[PDB]
Amino acid sequence: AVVKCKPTSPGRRHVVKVVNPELHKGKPFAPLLEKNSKSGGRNNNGRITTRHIGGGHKQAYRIVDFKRNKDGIPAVVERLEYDPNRSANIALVLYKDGERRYILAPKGLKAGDQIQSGVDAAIKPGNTLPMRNIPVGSTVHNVEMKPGKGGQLARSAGTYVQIVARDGAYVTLRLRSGEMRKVEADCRATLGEVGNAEHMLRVLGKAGAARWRGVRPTVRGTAMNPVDHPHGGGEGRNFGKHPVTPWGVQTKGKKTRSNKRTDKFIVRRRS
Amino acid sequence: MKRTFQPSVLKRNRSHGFRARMATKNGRQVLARRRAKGRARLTVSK
RNA sequence: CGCGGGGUGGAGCAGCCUGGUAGCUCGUCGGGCUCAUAACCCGAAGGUCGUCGGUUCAAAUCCGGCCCCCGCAACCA
RNA sequence: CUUUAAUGUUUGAUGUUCUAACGUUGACCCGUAAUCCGGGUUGCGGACAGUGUCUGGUGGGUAGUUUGACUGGGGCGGUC
RNA sequence: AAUUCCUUGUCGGGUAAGUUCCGACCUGCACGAAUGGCGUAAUGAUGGCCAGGCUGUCUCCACCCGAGACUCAGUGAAAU
RNA sequence: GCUCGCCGGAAGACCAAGGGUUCCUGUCCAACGUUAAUCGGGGCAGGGUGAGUCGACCCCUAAGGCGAGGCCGAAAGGCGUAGUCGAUGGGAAACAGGUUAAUAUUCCUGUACUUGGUGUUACUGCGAAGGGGGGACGGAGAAGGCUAUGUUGGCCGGGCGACGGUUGUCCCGGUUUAAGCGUGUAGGCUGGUUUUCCAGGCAAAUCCGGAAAAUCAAGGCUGAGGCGUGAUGACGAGGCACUACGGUGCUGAAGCAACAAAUGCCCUGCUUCCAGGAAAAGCCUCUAAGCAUCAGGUAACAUCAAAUCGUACCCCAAACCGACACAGGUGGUCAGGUAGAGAAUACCAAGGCGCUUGAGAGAACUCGGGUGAAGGAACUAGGCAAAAUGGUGCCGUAACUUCGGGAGAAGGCACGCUGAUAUGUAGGUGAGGUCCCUCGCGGAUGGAGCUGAAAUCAGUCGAAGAUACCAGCUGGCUGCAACUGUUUAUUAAAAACACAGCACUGUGCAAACACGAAAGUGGACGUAUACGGUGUGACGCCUGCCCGGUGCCGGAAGGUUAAU
RNA sequence: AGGACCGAACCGACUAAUGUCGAAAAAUUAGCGGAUGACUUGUGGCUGGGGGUGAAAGGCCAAUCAAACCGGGAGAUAGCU
RNA sequence: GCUUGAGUCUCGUAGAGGGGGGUAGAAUUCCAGGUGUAGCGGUGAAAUGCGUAGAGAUCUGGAGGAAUACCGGUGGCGAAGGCGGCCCCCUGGACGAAGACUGACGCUCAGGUGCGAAAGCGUGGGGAGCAAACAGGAUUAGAUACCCUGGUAGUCCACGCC
Numbered sequence A: 001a002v003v004k005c006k007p008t009s010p011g012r013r014h015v016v017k018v019v020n021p022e023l024h025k026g027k028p029f030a031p032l033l034e035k036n037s038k039s040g041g042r043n044n045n046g047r048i049t050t051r052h053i054g055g056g057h058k059q060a061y062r063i064v065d066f067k068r069n070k071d072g073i074p075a076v077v078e079r080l081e082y083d084p085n086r087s088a089n090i091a092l093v094l095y096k097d098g099e100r101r102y103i104l105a106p107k108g109l110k111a112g113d114q115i116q117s118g119v120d121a122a123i124k125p126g127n128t129l130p131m132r133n134i135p136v137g138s139t140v141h142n143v144e145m146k147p148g149k150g151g152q153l154a155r156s157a158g159t160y161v162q163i164v165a166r167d168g169a170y171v172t173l174r175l176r177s178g179e180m181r182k183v184e185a186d187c188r189a190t191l192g193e194v195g196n197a198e199h200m201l202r203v204l205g206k207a208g209a210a211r212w213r214g215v216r217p218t219v220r221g222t223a224m225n226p227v228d229h230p231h232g233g234g235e236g237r238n239f240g241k242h243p244v245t246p247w248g249v250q251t252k253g254k255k256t257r258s259n260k261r262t263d264k265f266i267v268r269r270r271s
Numbered sequence B: 001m002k003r004t005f006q007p008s009v010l011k012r013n014r015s016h017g018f019r020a021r022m023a024t025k026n027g028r029q030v031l032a033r034r035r036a037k038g039r040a041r042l043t044v045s046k
Numbered sequence C: 001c002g003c004g005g006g007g008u009g010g011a012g013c014a015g016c017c018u019g020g021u022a023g024c025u026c027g028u029c030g031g032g033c034u035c036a037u038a039a040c041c042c043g044a045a046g047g048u049c050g051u052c053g054g055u056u057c058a059a060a061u062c063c064g065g066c067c068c069c070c071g072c073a074a075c076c077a
Numbered sequence D: 001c002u003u004u005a006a007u008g009u010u011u012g013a014u015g016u017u018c019u020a021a022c023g024u025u026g027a028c029c030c031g032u033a034a035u036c037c038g039g040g041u042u043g044c045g046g047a048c049a050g051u052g053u054c055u056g057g058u059g060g061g062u063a064g065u066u067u068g069a070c071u072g073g074g075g076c077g078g079u080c
Numbered sequence E: 001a002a003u004u005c006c007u008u009g010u011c012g013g014g015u016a017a018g019u020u021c022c023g024a025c026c027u028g029c030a031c032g033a034a035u036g037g038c039g040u041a042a043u044g045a046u047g048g049c050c051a052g053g054c055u056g057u058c059u060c061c062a063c064c065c066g067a068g069a070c071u072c073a074g075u076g077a078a079a080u
Numbered sequence F: 001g002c003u004c005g006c007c008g009g010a011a012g013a014c015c016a017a018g019g020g021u022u023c024c025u026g027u028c029c030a031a032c033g034u035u036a037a038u039c040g041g042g043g044c045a046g047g048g049u050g051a052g053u054c055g056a057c058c059c060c061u062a063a064g065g066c067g068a069g070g071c072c073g074a075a076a077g078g079c080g081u082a083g084u085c086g087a088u089g090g091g092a093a094a095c096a097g098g099u100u101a102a103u104a105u106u107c108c109u110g111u112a113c114u115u116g117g118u119g120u121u122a123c124u125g126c127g128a129a130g131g132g133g134g135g136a137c138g139g140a141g142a143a144g145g146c147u148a149u150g151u152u153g154g155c156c157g158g159g160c161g162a163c164g165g166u167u168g169u170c171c172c173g174g175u176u177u178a179a180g181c182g183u184g185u186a187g188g189c190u191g192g193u194u195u196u197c198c199a200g201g202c203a204a205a206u207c208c209g210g211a212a213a214a215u216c217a218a219g220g221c222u223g224a225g226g227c228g229u230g231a232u233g234a235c236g237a238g239g240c241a242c243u244a245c246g247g248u249g250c251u252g253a254a255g256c257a258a259c260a261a262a263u264g265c266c267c268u269g270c271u272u273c274c275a276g277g278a279a280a281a282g283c284c285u286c287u288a289a290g291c292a293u294c295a296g297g298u299a300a301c302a303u304c305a306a307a308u309c310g311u312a313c314c315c316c317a318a319a320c321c322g323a324c325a326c327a328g329g330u331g332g333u334c335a336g337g338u339a340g341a342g343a344a345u346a347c348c349a350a351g352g353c354g355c356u357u358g359a360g361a362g363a364a365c366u367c368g369g370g371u372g373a374a375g376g377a378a379c380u381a382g383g384c385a386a387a388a389u390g391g392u393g394c395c396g397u398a399a400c401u402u403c404g405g406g407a408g409a410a411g412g413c414a415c416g417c418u419g420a421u422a423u424g425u426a427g428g429u430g431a432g433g434u435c436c437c438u439c440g441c442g443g444a445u446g447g448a449g450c451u452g453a454a455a456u457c458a459g460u461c462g463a464a465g466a467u468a469c470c471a472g473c474u475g476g477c478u479g480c481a482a483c484u485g486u487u488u489a490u491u492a493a494a495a496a497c498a499c500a501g502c503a504c505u506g507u508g509c510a511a512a513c514a515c516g517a518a519a520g521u522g523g524a525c526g527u528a529u530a531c532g533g534u535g536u537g538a539c540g541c542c543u544g545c546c547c548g549g550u551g552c553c554g555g556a557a558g559g560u561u562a563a564u
Numbered sequence G: 001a002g003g004a005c006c007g008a009a010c011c012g013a014c015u016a017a018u019g020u021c022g023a024a025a026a027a028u029u030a031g032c033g034g035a036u037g038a039c040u041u042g043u044g045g046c047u048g049g050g051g052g053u054g055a056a057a058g059g060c061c062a063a064u065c066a067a068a069c070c071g072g073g074a075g076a077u078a079g080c081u
Numbered sequence H: 001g002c003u004u005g006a007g008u009c010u011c012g013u014a015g016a017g018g019g020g021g022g023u024a025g026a027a028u029u030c031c032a033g034g035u036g037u038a039g040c041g042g043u044g045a046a047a048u049g050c051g052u053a054g055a056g057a058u059c060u061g062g063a064g065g066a067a068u069a070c071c072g073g074u075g076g077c078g079a080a081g082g083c084g085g086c087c088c089c090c091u092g093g094a095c096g097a098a099g100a101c102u103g104a105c106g107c108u109c110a111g112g113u114g115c116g117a118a119a120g121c122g123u124g125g126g127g128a129g130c131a132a133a134c135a136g137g138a139u140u141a142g143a144u145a146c147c148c149u150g151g152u153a154g155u156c157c158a159c160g161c162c
């Protein structure tokens, strides 16, 4: 649910909270938890490549399934969980052979539902099927690029893809942002929208309520001295140069779409 | 005021030790120059 | 102190640069339309070109002096 | 001369198809208990992409310099 | 007015007396809507002002208790 | 040696870091010490550091470094796999007392524990760089059960006391005891045992996990402390007896009860919330390639071994770091009495020191402070500085508001000692006693002892009772910025920066972008409810007109146009 | 519960005074703000010169920063003293 | 206690009554493509605008959104606002018939509670058509109007407010 907390203090006053009464409040499965040391945006050399990264809270990574490779075997949604590095919740399901493995959490799902993959799995939120067995006009998630790679598209809270058409070996998708890509016909998808459907309405309320998550204060360009950034300096807040990035590249409208080998697969770009 | 120098053997030897020089070509130049000069305390050691 | 620009019918602006010729809108005047007025239509009139001198075949125009007006500048210690 | 028509011929410019160059941060297997890598399969792209030489454009992101003198001190103006 | 040079602009309040301050008048040298505009509870080792309390801040200082200054013995520098 | 004074959550006692003999003793006094100096962290000679249980080393990993081949790079070299390093982390084991001028959980005395080697006996399937369990985990908050430890009382020993009383509810000193072994409590976790089956755990699997029935309701795991034991032992105030009068030899009573109580422990728990909280080995379990009269494994027992390095002293400081015997900085632990909420503060204990120049003087002037007639900001750039307000309970409290606040608003009242209610209450702990029982560290019950607020009434004393130290100045209008926070180390802490929020815009994944000549990484083991850039800056009411110039985006026909 | 309130430790550094050849090459004294957090700090690594780092002052990078230190070009150059 | 008030029960009636969830076609718009060619569009006229890069017209396909022709009627339903493509699901109200049962359980109602077009507001989606504001073009003495070409919020969706 969504709750605007009581104004007991300035800083708490503007917080809105995501109270999930479903997520398992115990401790997760150990064998699917590996270390994940944060890197603050530093490369192999050691210099910071991307800014605003670091601090945060010490977290462990939950290795989840993407492939849905073990086919033909039914499963039961044992319980839901909370995942730090996702947006959507993750669910610990159990195969009929006795192997537990995590998978993402689709919208309408309860602890105790039935999910399975392959080609025989019916049309229900959670079942994984190649796109040549999926009805046109359906909503899916975790779309693959190449068959078996795992799934790339639509993975965060409520991000869903609407299949457009299925001409030949090229099935057409309509991405969440608004781009018509044409992909391999054997790309595996998963029915229904992803869960954690209220994530968008969450506000932080505090500066620290973003700090332990991983960000760093963003310093504006106009405050910095001209030797640091392509803006700034001046006696008394001046500006007037063409808005850019810390490296001269004009921002606020300047396309950098250049990969070209994926030009064949992009039918329509974002309007 | 914290005087700009705190001792630490381990940290010192990992940045000014004998082997702290032999791991690189430059260190081989420093070991050469100090020997060329006739120095006695080539590097902080025993 | 200095730089640039402007002053033209009642009013606001063209024309000057590349000299002989001054136009536009409104307004005034006269007639018509209307019961009467405005608006509209038709017609006609009106300028010492801020002032003065000079150069020139010819000066609103080109130069220089003066008045008024507008902007800029009138600084670093 | 021009307008035109068929063929031969000449290379050039588009579109589609193909597989062998090639890419593969797709799946599998082995070297090997090794998510690097190499090779062998197979699928998907495919003579594109990408790299190299030449070339126009953009370019303070970066770099080397210029930015006069006289002046009743310098500046503004004026002037040579 | 953190913005008004002329200016301490004019009027009103506070004061016995107010270039500061509060509130208005628009005659805005040269305010103005994300180089954000106008308000705003709370907060601030912040900025300006008035009132109470309070005192040596002051009228106008006097005395008092210690460290030095002065003297004796020992040691013994400095810029110039 | 006798008084005095000072710190006592330190100026004390121990480890780490780091120093490097500065520790102790004898001797010496030129030089060093901001003075003298028979003194010393000074010179000279000699002595001192004793470990299977402490730590390091070792086994195992994090960040990250090195990195066989390998990829890339003019050369150097860069990145990185398998591996191997790398503690501030995890992993076997000892406590008490005595002793030297200086070292001791290291030596001596007593009493124990751990890990392997080998041999013997009785049983028995063992067996990996592979699988599984375990190790193995967040902050905050609360309660209960205890201990460390302190006080009080009894008991034992000593004194009955240099000015008035003091054989008594009197006073002084003491009343300490571990690890290990046994028990397994308070209390915490979780349903146990068994038969069968399985595409799961890159192979197998008797192991875990999954799916069905059987049987019973307990079993198992964990676990501070206490009680016994350790211990007719040591220690022990005080005597006895010798002094090189430094100290030694000998001897040695009581050694319990209760209450108060931690931030230590149970708790690496429990409840809850979110920002969702190392890895590996040791350890235990299971089998494969195999080997099976074996070898090995397990239990008991005899016996051997556990090396090497550090160990002194300083360690909130004249020994570290600051040139110095420097008013400075320096991580962790232990941390007593009264008042007090407390680790504040005042005064004391253990313990350690009197700060390395002193003696007179009592001027101006300066520094650090005390008080002050009358007035009360008249000072002044400005109430800067001082003054003052300052505790608890209780009563009471405005504008405005985001309805939380403003608010400790403002402003007041009672505060001491003594008796009484009550030869000390409410409340707390709680023996003896009694009964019960799945018989034990047990339950009801019982209530003495012990301990102990506040309140009400009365009396009484001082000028003054939160009597000291400690300990808010309050209020009105108002600019700016939301607020917490951050920054110019060393003249500027602010209205600057940041901030959650909003908006524009880039990005379809080998993502944009960034470091790197490259490979490769970061972005992200995320993927449009995501991420980067930019502007602005909570929230409330909103956010007008202009595409001329610049930039960006879209469009391509034509003109112009590079190499070829 | 809290980037909540009061206030020691701890951290920081707002006013004034002392000091300025000081005790000290930014401290002491009396008072101040944070003080469960964007908190503080120990041990150990990583990022480096036109580079790093930066809640952004052109602050910080060994008492030094509008481009560190050391050696080398190098006896740089100077119409200047 | 009775029964003419009112109410419940058995069987049926018609209905845009309502909520949630699916689905269909005409039409519009846009995008890609073929054909093909100088106007198209609009008005009182004109202009703005679009167009020889090649519109419109015409043919084909695809992507979305909203509204539901004819049926449709001073027809029906609900307290009212208000509600009509079709369908499934949950569900409300009124009415008709033959009798029975309870036996006045009634009529109304300040305050109190709820429902309540549109416009408008908060949050997050959607955006075809239409269209405040605004701009441009004209008419006009003037026209920040009527008329014309564009066009944001909005109108649409879910949860709330008003």
Ligand SMILES: *C(=O)[C@H](CCSC)NC=O
Binding pocket: C077
């Ligand atoms: C000019 O005013 C001059 C500036 C000196 S900056 C050190 N000051 C004169 O007194």
